[PDB]
């Protein structure tokens, strides 16, 4: 055939892929973490948005740190051969490099490692997208007038 | 030319390759959320995806998200400490190719 | 609609906005350099800028750099610990617009 350039990911597999949405709104009283009002609006908006992009959306609400890890592990263990990509959206409280389960923290690295090129072979060479809505610290940007 | 670190017989890619992290905010900063309309970042991300997913490459879509959040949002709080604050999303790409949701 | 965090009378932008950090490697990882040809990242960055600066948007140029480093380079060392290693650059963008070096 003619000149072949591979500058863009192959996105015409039978499936676009999974879009896992972890929506943590209510936290265990024991942690004292405040409920994240308005997060349901985000979760719904994301579900519809990615649905229209043809992703297989799976929403999970109020997951403990253990459930977040088990979910990611199980998902990384699936056969993504016929899927073009992978998307995971995390909605919760957080700090730099950390996302909060309803009962404690989860290192983002712990979550993303399951999808490493050598640990999830059916996603090797495919885009793995992690969308994170959470604090990355306590610094405040006062901005500047334009 | 020739070297010890190139033209490998067996091709491999980094295990960290092909990851894209779309952070709602810059490293070390707070991330704002409206208790009624949702987070500034997700609100903006969905809006830009809905309007540009069938037109622009992903990084360019996320750049529009950066601009939307940076220019259109500012916090309001009865607490001076958290009032009049801004936010800039942070795109972290280890992708190796352009990404279009359409084909 | 109307809200307390939008449509500000006085427009401001985040002080962290409009920054782009082109890291040679992923967070927490080593960055490799050939004692004779230079670092893998800079070698690749210059090559892609020379070939695409008058053709592609900056993020797309950096994406080519990511691919070049990720696929074409692998370390060689007499020390097994540092032998056969890979590298993936890390693009961190807080930019709010597309960037073309030409006009």
């Amino acid at each position: 055939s003619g000149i072949s350039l591979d500058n863009s990911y192959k996105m015409d597999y039978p499936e676009m892929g999974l879009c896992i949405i972890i929506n943590n709104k209510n936290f265990h009283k024991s942690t004292g973490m405040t409920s994240r009002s308005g997060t349901d609006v985000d979760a719904a908006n994301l579900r519809e948005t990615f649905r229209n992009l043809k992703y297989e959306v799976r929403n999970k609400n109020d997951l403990t740190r253990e459930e977040i890890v088990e979910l990611m592990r199980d998902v990384s263990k699936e056969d993504h051969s016929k899927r073009s990509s992978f998307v995971c959206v995390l909605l919760s409280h957080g700090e730099e490099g950390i996302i909060f389960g309803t009962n404690g923290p989860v290192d983002l690295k712990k979550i993303t490692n399951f999808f490493r090129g050598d640990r999830c072979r059916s996603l090797t060479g495919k885009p793995k997208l992690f969308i994170i809505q959470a604090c990355r610290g306590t610094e405040l940007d006062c901005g500047i007038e334009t | 030319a020739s070297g010890v670190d190139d033209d490998m017989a067996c091709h491999k890619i980094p295990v960290e390759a092909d990851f894209l992290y779309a952070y709602s905010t810059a490293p070390g900063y707070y991330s704002w959320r409206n208790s009624k309309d949702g987070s500034w970042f997700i609100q903006s991300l969905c809006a830009m995806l809905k309007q540009y997913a069938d037109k622009l490459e992903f990084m360019h879509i996320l750049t529009r998200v950066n601009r939307k959040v940076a220019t259109e949002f500012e916090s309001f709080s009865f607490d001076a400490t958290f009032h009049a604050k801004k936010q800039i999303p942070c795109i972290v790409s280890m992708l190796t190719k352009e990404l279009y949701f359409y084909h | 609609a109307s809200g307390v965090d939008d449509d500000m009378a006085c427009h401001k932008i985040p002080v962290e906005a409009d920054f782009l950090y082109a890291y040679s490697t992923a967070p927490g990882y080593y960055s490799w350099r050939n004692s004779k040809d230079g670092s893998w990242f800079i070698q690749s960055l210059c090559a892609m800028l020379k070939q695409y600066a008058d053709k592609l948007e900056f993020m797309h140029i950096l994406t080519r750099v990511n691919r070049k480093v990720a696929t074409e380079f692998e370390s060689f060392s007499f020390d097994a610990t540092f032998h056969a290693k890979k590298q993936i650059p890390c693009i961190v963008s807080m930019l709010t617009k597309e960037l073309y070096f030409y006009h």
């Binding site: 405040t34 994240r36 009002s37 308005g38 604090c135 306590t138 | 707070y30 991330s31 704002w32 959320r33 409206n34 208790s35 916090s75 309001f76 709080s77 958290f82 | 307390v4 965090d5």
Partner: peptide, 4 residues
């Protein structure tokens, strides 16, 4: 506005 919510965010700490």
């Amino acid at each position: 506005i919510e965010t700490a």
